[PDB]
C-alpha cells in the first residue's frame, strides 16, 4: 500500500522528513558495514562484540551431517508414542510389555534427559543418551537400547 505509507503524508513538506541541515546525502557513513574498526567502532563495541578476529580452529569441508544429533528430551519422549495408543500405555505397561520408542525413526539422535517421565517403563531406542536420560529411564523401569 502506497496510500498508507508515510511518504504520502510528507508531501508538501520540503525535506521528506529528512531534515534540512542534514540533507539526506547518499552514503554519508560509508557502506554497509564500513569503518567497523574506525568510525563505527562505537556501534561495533556496543551491540555486537566478538565481531573482529578469528576465534577457534577451522574445519575444512565440514559436512553438516556428522553434526546431526538432534536432541529429544525425556519430557517430550512420550510424544513419539502414537496419539491414540498412549492413553492405554501411560496407565499400565507393568514391565515386559513396554511401548518401544524408536527416536531415530522419529528423527532424533540423542535422548537427553530434561523433564521427568512417569513411572511407566518405556524401552527407548536411540543413537545416544545423556548419562541422566538413561538413569531416568532405568529408574522408571524401561531401558535404553542403542543402535
Amino acid at each position: 500500500p502506497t496510500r498508507l505509507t508515510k511518504t504520502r503524508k510528507h508531501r508538501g513538506h520540503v525535506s521528506a522528513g529528512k531534515g534540512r541541515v542534514g540533507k539526506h546525502r547518499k552514503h554519508p557513513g560509508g557502506r554497509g558495514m564500513a569503518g567497523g574498526l574506525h568510525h563505527h567502532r562505537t556501534n561495533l563495541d556496543k551491540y555486537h562484540p566478538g565481531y573482529f578476529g578469528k576465534v577457534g580452529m577451522r574445519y575444512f569441508h565440514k559436512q553438516q551431517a556428522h553434526f546431526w544429533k538432534p536432541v529429544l528430551n525425556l519430557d517430550k519422549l512420550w510424544t513419539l508414542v502414537p496419539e491414540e495408543k498412549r492413553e492405554e500405555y501411560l496407565k499400565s505397561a507393568s514391565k515386559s510389555a513396554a511401548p518401544v520408542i524408536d527416536t531415530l525413526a522419529a528423527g532424533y539422535g540423542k535422548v537427553l534427559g530434561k523433564g521427568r517421565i512417569p513411572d511407566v517403563p518405556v524401552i527407548v531406542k536411540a543413537r545416544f543418551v545423556s548419562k541422566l536420560a538413561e538413569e531416568k529411564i532405568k529408574a522408571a523401569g524401561g531401558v535404553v537400547e542403542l543402535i
Partner: protein, 184 residues
Amino acid sequence: IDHTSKQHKRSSHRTAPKSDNVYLKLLVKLYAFLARRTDAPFNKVILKSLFLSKINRPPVSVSRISRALKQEGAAQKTIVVVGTVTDDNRIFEFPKTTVAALRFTAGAKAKILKAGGEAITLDQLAVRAPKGQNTLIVRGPRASREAARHFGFGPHKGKAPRIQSTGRKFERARGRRRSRAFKV
C-alpha cells in the same frame, strides 16, 4: 501558563483494542459493560487484558493452568485466561476443571475435555461469574519472548545479541574473551 507536565498526554494504555476483530469487540462491550456496572475489580482486569496485543497475551499452557490449580485453596476455582490456552504434553494427569479462555487449541480443548473438564469462553464466564466469583486469573510469561532477550543489550548486561547465525565465527572473538583484547 507554566506546564509542569506534558499537555494532552495520551493514556499510554490501550483503551480500545487496535484489533479489528468483530467478535472480540462484542467481548469487550460486554466486559466494559460489567467493569463499570459491577464495581468488581476482576472485571476491570479482564477488560484490560482483552485489549492487550498478541505479544502481551502470551499462550498459557494447560500445564501452567494445572499449577495454578495445585495452589492452596484453589483446586476448584475457575481459571480465567485471557489469551490462548495451548496444549502441553509434558504434563500428563491434567485435572478435572473449568477454564475460560479466549481461544483454545484443538490439543488443549481436547486435553481439558478428556479430564471431565470444561472449555469455556469469556461470555460464558460472564454468565457464571459476572463479578468474578471464585475465578483465578492466569497469565502467560511475557519476559520469555524471543525478542525480549535482545532488549537492553550492552556491556555487561548479560543479554542476547541479535544475529542471524550462529555459533563460532559469529560474534565470538574480539570483545568476547580476554584472549582477543577484552571481555565486553
